[model samples]
Target: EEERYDLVEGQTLTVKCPFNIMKYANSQKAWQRLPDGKEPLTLVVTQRPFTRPSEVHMGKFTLKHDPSEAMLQVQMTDLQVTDSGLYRCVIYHPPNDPVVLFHPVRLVVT
Candidate 1:
């Protein structure tokens, strides 16, 4: 199943990972915006083996990882109408592998 969220323009949207964190802790994690008929746009990412609470900021996006709680949070600030779309919290496997764990999210910005 997928998760959904609705927000108005200028609001902040926070998306949390829905999978078990421990299993993917050593993998690369990324937040991507999936635009219709286009390639997924990566918003933010955290490198492998996140060991502590950390934050990464890129323009209007922020990615937070809390190893203590085994959680990952993606925050997008100042939402715009164009931001409405499908997003994904992805865990990438080894370079030679094609495996990936993804959680789909539907976001509507009005």
Candidate 2:
């Protein structure tokens, strides 16, 4: 199970998306944000910078991965009330399937 946190405003927040590194070695990580209520869900990053993939900068959000870790790191810079929501990390392994749900991390900016 993933842990939820109440992050204070003005502090940066980082959430880890757990997945099998060996299973999806060639996969790329994608971070998505599900807005509250009526807002639509949007993608934060198409792929982590590990493979130097062509990434479209949406805002102050970023997804990163370390060579030594299986989980992808979702970092949101300059936390604010608008940053609070449910974040989901996805892995895109081409050929067979493009999108695979990895993990979910909930955050509240208070």
Candidate 3:
């Protein structure tokens, strides 16, 4: 459903994750990603088909979902120079097949 968003350095961008992917409506899922040399980060709200964020992030961030659109909103705030990089939004349902529910949903803040 999504892939990525690219922005200038210090610019803010939003990422979205949707649960109950079409592939497995019977199961639960989450949005997760592994930072370089770091453990994977998981947003626990996928069960409700929600979004998640981290402390490494600051400022304002908003998460919203519209089942009608199958979309989620990321209100990133006060983006910083360090925000420049790759942000990925992936939806995963275990067992049957755990894949990115949405596209890489990559956000390039450059």
Best by TM-score: 1
Off by over 4 Å in 3: 1-4, 15-33, 43-59, 92-98
Worst 10 residues of 2 by lDDT: 47-56
Model 1 per-residue lDDT tens digits across residues 65-97: 866666778899999999898988776443543
The TM-score between candidate 1 and the true structure equals 0.82
Give lDDT for model 1: 0.75
| Local distance difference test, candidate 2 | 0.64
Q: Assess each prediction's global lDDT (C-alpha) against the native.
A: 0.75, 0.64, 0.49
Q: Which ten residues in a row have the lowest lDDT in candidate 1?
A: 93-102
lDDT of 3 by residue, 36-59 (tens): 787556543334422332223223
Using all chains and alpha carbons, the TM-scores for the candidates as numbered come to: 0.82, 0.68, 0.52
Error of 1 at 81 (Å): 0.5
TM-score result, candidate 2: 0.68
TM-score comparison, 2 vs 3, better candidate? 2
In angstroms, the error of model 3 at 26 is 7.4
